[PDB]
Design a protein around this ligand. Sequence first.
Ligand SMILES: *[C@H](C)[C@H]1/C(=C/c2[nH]c(/C=C3N=C(/C=C4/NC(=O)C(CC)=C4C)C(C)=C\3CCC(=O)O)c(CCC(=O)O)c2C)NC(=O)[C@@H]1C
Ligand SMILES: *[C@H](C)[C@H]1/C(=C/c2[nH]c(/C=C3N=C(/C=C4/NC(=O)C(CC)=C4C)C(C)=C\3CCC(=O)O)c(CCC(=O)O)c2C)NC(=O)[C@@H]1C
Ligand SMILES: [Mg+2]
Ligand SMILES: [Mg+2]
Ligand SMILES: [Mg+2]
Ligand SMILES: [Mg+2]
Lengths: 305, 303
Amino acid sequence: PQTSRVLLIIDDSPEDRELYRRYLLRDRDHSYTVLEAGLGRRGLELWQQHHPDAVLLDYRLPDLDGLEFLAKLQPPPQQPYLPVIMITGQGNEAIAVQAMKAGAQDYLVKEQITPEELHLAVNGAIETVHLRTQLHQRIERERVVSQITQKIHQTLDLEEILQTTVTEVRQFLQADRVFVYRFQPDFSGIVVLESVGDNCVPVIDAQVEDFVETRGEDYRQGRIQAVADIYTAGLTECHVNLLAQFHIRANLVVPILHADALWGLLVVNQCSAPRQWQPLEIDLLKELATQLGIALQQAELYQQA
Amino acid sequence: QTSRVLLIIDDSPEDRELYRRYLLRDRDHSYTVLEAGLGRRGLELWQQHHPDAVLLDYRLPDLDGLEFLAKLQPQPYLPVIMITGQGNEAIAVQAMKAGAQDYLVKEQITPEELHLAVNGAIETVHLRTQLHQRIERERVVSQITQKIHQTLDLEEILQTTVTEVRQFLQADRVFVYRFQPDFSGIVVLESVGDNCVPVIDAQVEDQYFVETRGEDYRQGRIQAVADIYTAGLTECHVNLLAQFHIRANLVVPILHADALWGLLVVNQCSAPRQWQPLEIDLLKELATQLGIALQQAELYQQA
Ligand SMILES: *[C@H](C)[C@H]1/C(=C/c2[nH]c(/C=C3N=C(/C=C4/NC(=O)C(CC)=C4C)C(C)=C\3CCC(=O)O)c(CCC(=O)O)c2C)NC(=O)[C@@H]1C
Ligand SMILES: *[C@H](C)[C@H]1/C(=C/c2[nH]c(/C=C3N=C(/C=C4/NC(=O)C(CC)=C4C)C(C)=C\3CCC(=O)O)c(CCC(=O)O)c2C)NC(=O)[C@@H]1C
Ligand SMILES: [Mg+2]
Ligand SMILES: [Mg+2]
Ligand SMILES: [Mg+2]
Ligand SMILES: [Mg+2]
């Protein structure tokens, strides 16, 4: 009975919209909340305002046809693919084939739709967009990693490597802030590099003194700190106050090891809201940190020569 | 127009012929169509021909669609489209849960629906396969990266690389060819199954690179040859490779500083093999990582 999917139906026949709603009720696996529009314009507003999990789109509407509609649909950057199923007229398959090249996941012929066919198409559209998104992110993640490896092979300057790392990581994660924290001999730390958008307070020029001496045992042993919400993570009053002071709400911290030594931290922040850090994100940061370590070893070995 | 192999499993010869006609109407693709009238024969043809898609009748004399699916032991995904009777949709839903990509209602089949379903099945299996490959590929690269971070031992790094790339590619042989100062070559490491004649300790000395100095490889040339016999190589080159049962060959240069240090080579020895962009890019990235390990070992030596 709990809503498990939201579907937007855009179709100028109210009776057909009601038919598809009923058909969806037959699905034992999901509970659908259905948004309804009779015009392309209202359908676009509902898509933008309410983010449905899938769309059933009539190939012909009073104000737009399906192709014009698809063209105006902007996906979220979180999922740059459109969970759209085109419903086309009998004998009009060719138009629907064009709709798939333009981003639709599937199509149905209006007259031949059964409850089962509908559940199938909707299931498929949602699953396929999820699959396309996963593949998309792997390609991006491999690009970022491969780029750092190339810079190291080319023996480029450490500063450029850190800068590329912080920028590309922030862009990939869509994070509010990413920075590199370097430990000095006296076990003090300074922020060396920062990439920050509009959501956080810049920290590069506003840092005082601060813990590595006393509890970097975990960082030295390569462990990461993943905090979804600073208020529910059980930190000390001081630590929470410090992070809140810079509007940090979620915190992901990965150590940078040079040989066996704790050189610094690669840190990611969300400042706008809590954020659950995901396995693929954590693995990427860990791999980048390892690469930074390799770059550090290169620079030191190069220095001694 | 790309070629596809499709397997039809249906005990009605007239239905098989209808779907064959329907497929030929597709102007985008060229179909080689295999046919079976029994599930048991359909299973053996699937095993022998690895078709791009399968049309599977929900009711066969020896097996039903679900039993057939259960017996398909391929981490691949199955490009199977189930064909079910009207009113038997419940069976088709079960098939979707059991690995089928799509289903069609026999009475309702049009040429267009058939093309849509076949395309979707193939495209979807392709997505899942690529995702799988990207995940495996990242593991190999990450492992090498960890090894470089943890050690200067060039041999262990080279060894891990050869073993993992071979395993990932399911290739018959992978080896590392290192150049001597005079650009003569030696095989330093080899990973080989049973399909090829081992080339370490079975040395063929070659001087071809003393002459040219691998300059084409030094500026990054990669060689990706699917079939040594049809690639337009010289009679001699072919003969040397034929001697070691090499059938397909993939060669990626290893660069140390700006110098051609050696070659990372992969061979297929049982059959021709088209090397894929993802595979070629993985080998380049690894060759680049080897370069980093080489550079590190050199800067270390100097201290
Ligand atoms: C409270 C008594 C004191 C204190 C405690 C404290 N600090 C940390 C961890 C970090 N402190 C960071 C300091 C900086 N400096 C910056 O410029 C900056 C942001 C711009 C920060 C966040 C710092 C980078 C860390 C890293 C880990 C993190 O959570 O961000 C901790 C946590 C230790 C642990 O391992 O849990 C504590 C308890 N800091 C003080 O200044 C106090 C005197
Ligand atoms: C014909 C005149 C002779 C000849 C030609 C030849 N060889 C190459 C390239 C390679 N030769 C390789 C030699 C080795 N040694 C091995 O132990 C071994 C496999 C186990 C081989 C393959 C060698 C590694 C290469 C690298 C490129 C490759 O194809 O593997 C070439 C040119 C290749 C190109 O693309 O230019 C030629 C013309 N080798 C002989 O022994 C002949 C006398
Ligand atoms: Mg209409
Ligand atoms: Mg369908
Ligand atoms: Mg039958
Ligand atoms: Mg599909």
